[PDB]
């Protein structure tokens, strides 16, 4: 009987909540009071990158912390040289409605996708001087939202069909299909070990999946709106969640509950991109008020404001070594921020 | 700079020329978005001129791009901001769906949300009330009382069609800055492409005055 099963679901939810309360001894705010505050952090732009003729929707850093890839609505992917502000490549796209981009760890391939429900993958190390597409991944019903590279043969893709999937390069088939999300998922972040990933959906829930098997290990709730971005903590057992409301939540995999909430009354705009620092002490989150806010990951106190864009910031990026922060917005401008 | 550094710099400048050429060419193409509700005459006007289908046609030496997002089957508000800034929005609403909760109430609800959307606070809306031939054979027996209960007119097509058009005209609160164009088309109609050209002509005029700083 469906009614009995529905009632049993509430009982299981109550048991999980009771277990979470039992393991909740103290709060991170109480333990962090004795540590020295970070203070005020001043960030100044160093290199500004121009050439895009439309709003920038995605931007991913390379492994060498020098090459940068950005996607725009003009239908072109530009490989930027951060150090010298140069265009290594300009990959035309058959569809000018992309909203995601990815950089392979080896740098040989660059992936993109959008409303065409195709995750095109382009080869950058061709014998010829041009960038040629390698494989067109088809099988998703909803719009492409995010794509991440685990290796040169497997890519994890999250679409708008409330279903994530893991693809293969040699064969355009879905090796593993992830199901369980009741709403649209518009972001995805991969763990450093390339074994688990967290997807933020429209039902204000973050789900942790395993690549090898495909079932949901844990589920995280607490938000009141659709989650637009998510990013794994440097350590590996935590992640930061940003939603359409004006708050950011940090969840711990081992605790399986919310740790600390970053919010203020002066902010009434959502977060479009969430990123961390190399040491994990600094939390950087974009906002729709044309400003990027730097949050303390341990004290929930603001450290600095990155206000250099005249349009909404859509993507955020921190290099592997943590020596630079790249911020992209809808003003077709890319900026790199660093301390002094 | 070194020998290879200068070559890399020159290569970037060559891409800049290509980007500028592509951007200038793309700026001369009028972008149109098709938002038919449940295939309500959406496919009967494409021939008269995969997730997204792009239709390209030229009228009066003007390039037109038509985008169909009826097959997305996802959340509308997650990608409705990508089409912000289009020249005009083409809306297709059937007229024979009043008899068939109701198929036009969904169209009215869908029209209300997009017309009042933040990203489309100034984009022109081109309503296409097609399937008017079937309206003649359906209004004789089935009246408009089933669809609209607050109807006092007769069963004549002249006044009943205006009532349906009127109900789609007071669904926008920003009447002082956004204007909705309405037309009654059919399968045999051949002037539908002409109406779109006149509709986008006004938008170009407003953009032309914006560029010169007059408005």
């Amino acid at each position, epitope marked *: 009987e469906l009614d009995q099963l529905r009632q049993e679901a509430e009982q299981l939810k109550n048991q999980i909540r009771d277990a979470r309360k039992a393991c909740a001894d103290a709060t991170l705010s109480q333990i962090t009071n004795n540590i020295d505050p970070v203070g005020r952090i001043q960030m100044r732009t160093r290199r500004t990158l121009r050439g895009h003729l439309a709003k920038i929707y995605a931007m991913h850093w390379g492994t060498d912390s020098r090459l940068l890839v950005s996607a725009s609505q003009d239908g072109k992917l530009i490989i930027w040289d951060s150090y010298t502000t140069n265009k290594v490549h300009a990959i035309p796209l058959r569809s000018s409605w992309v909203m995601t981009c990815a950089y392979a760890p080896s740098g040989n391939y660059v992936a993109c996708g959008g409303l065409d429900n195709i995750c095109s993958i382009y080869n950058l190390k061709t014998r*010829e001087g041009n960038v040629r597409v390698s494989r067109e991944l088809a099988g998703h019903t909803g719009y492409l939202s995010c794509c991440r590279f685990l290796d040169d043969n497997q890519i994890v893709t999250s679409s708008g069909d409330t279903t994530c999937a893991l693809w293969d390069i040699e064969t355009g088939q879905q090796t593993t299909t992830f199901t369980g999300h009741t709403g649209d998922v518009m972001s995805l972040s991969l763990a450093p070990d390339t074994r688990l990933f967290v997807s933020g959906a429209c039902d204000a829930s973050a789900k942790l999946w395993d690549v090898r098997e495909g079932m949901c290990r844990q589920t995280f709730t607490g938000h009141e709106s659709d989650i637009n971005a998510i990013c794994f903590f440097p350590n590996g057992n935590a992640f930061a969640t940003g939603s359409d409301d004006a708050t950011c939540r940090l969840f711990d995999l081992r605790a399986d509950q919310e740790l600390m909430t970053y919010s203020h009354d002066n902010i009434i705009c959502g977060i479009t991109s969430v990123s961390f620092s190399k040491s994990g002490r600094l939390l950087l989150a974009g906002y729709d008020d044309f400003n990027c806010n730097v949050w303390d990951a341990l004290k929930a106190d603001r450290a600095g404001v990155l206000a250099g864009h005249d349009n909404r910031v859509s993507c955020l990026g921190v290099t592997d070594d943590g020596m630079a922060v790249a911020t992209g917005s809808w003003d077709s401008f890319l900026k790199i921020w660093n301390g002094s | 700079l070194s020998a290879e550094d200068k070559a890399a710099v*020159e290569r970037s400048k060559m891409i800049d020329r290509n980007l500028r050429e592509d951007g200038e060419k793309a700026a001369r193409e009028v972008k149109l978005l098709l938002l038919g509700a449940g295939e309500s005459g959406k496919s009967t006007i494409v021939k008269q001129m995969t997730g997204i289908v792009e239709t390209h046609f030229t009228f009066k030496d003007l390039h037109f791009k038509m985008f169909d997002v009826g097959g997305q089957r996802s959340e509308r508000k997650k990608w409705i901001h990508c089409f912000e800034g289009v020249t005009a929005i083409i809306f297709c609403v059937a007229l024979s769906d009043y008899d068939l909760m109701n198929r036009m109430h969904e169209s009215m609800k869908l029209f209300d949300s997009i017309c009042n959307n933040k990203w489309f606070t100034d984009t022109s809306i081109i309503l296409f009330l097609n399937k008017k031939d079937l309206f003649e054979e359906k209004i004789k027996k089935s009246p408009l009382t089933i669809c609209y209960p607050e109807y006092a007119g007769s069963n004549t097509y002249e006044e009943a069609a205006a009532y349906i058009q009127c109900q789609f005209e007071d669904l926008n609160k920003r009447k002082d800055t956004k204007e909705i164009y309405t037309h009654f088309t059919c399968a045999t109609d051949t002037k539908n492409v002409q109406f779109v050209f006149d509709a986008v002509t006004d938008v170009i005029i407003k953009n032309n005055l914006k560029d010169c700083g007059l408005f």
Partner: single-chain antibody, 235 residues
């Protein structure tokens, strides 16, 4: 398949004119830079001219400056080298070499087959080791190289290129930027250096590894090839 075919060679009287054509097929010719390298009979390699992708950047060697002119036809995918006032010192095998900004550098990976040409009648100097080194399979061979000016730029990049010239075959690039390995090159090749002194080490030797090794610098333009080290089988 990348292919470069050179045509337009023959007997030329002194003081005459001749045009060399190098046809490019199998790759994007528009985005690829081109170079002309000539090899005199029983002598080494020397640079002649270079044309950029957009044909707006052209350089010429001091010897052939003015007399020689180079042009390209992107729609026809053909390289042109018009020569005037040919002397007896221009008798050499001309090679068309493609270049592109790749991996942060401009390698010379692909070389043309070359065409015969007989005429009947401040620069950095790269000093190489002895031009006669007897080698045997299974041994490790190190080839030394020297430069008058340090090749280490302010960006931490050293501009060195190593080429292998098989007997009767076009030269093939092995190591570029003194540390990177070209595509298709076996891992047995290693390169190292610091400023002016450079070396190339081969771990395992093979019968197909014989030939003449050349070293060139891409620091300034004015790319001077080395004297050339020849490897011969001991038996």
């Amino acid at each position: 398949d990348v292919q470069l075919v050179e045509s337009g060679g023959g007997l030329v009287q002194p003081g005459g004119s001749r045009k060399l054509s190098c046809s490019a097929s199998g790759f994007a010719f528009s985005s690829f830079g081109m170079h002309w390298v000539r090899q005199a009979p029983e002598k080494g390699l020397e640079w002649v001219a270079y044309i950029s992708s957009g044909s707006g950047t052209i350089y010429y060697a001091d010897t052939v400056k003015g007399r020689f002119t180079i042009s390209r036809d992107d729609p026809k995918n053909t390289l042109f080298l018009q020569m005037t006032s040919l002397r007896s010192e221009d008798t050499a095998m001309y090679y068309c070499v493609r270049s592109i900004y790749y991996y942060g550098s401009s390698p010379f990976d692909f070389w043309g087959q070359g065409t015969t040409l007989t005429v009947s009648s401040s620069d950095i100097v790269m000093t190489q080791a002895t031009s006669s080194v007897p080698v045997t399979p299974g041994e490790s061979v190190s080839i030394s190289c020297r430069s008058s000016k340090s090749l280490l730029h302010s960006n931490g990049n050293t501009y060195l290129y190593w080429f292998l010239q098989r007997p009767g075959q076009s030269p093939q690039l092995l190591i570029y930027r003194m540390s990177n390995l070209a595509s298709g090159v076996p891992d047995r090749f290693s390169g190292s250096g610091s400023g002016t002194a450079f070396t190339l080490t081969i771990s395992r030797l093979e019968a197909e590894d014989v030939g003449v090794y050349y070293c060139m610098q891409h620091l300034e333009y004015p790319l001077t090839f080395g004297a050339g080290t020849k490897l011969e089988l001991k038996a």
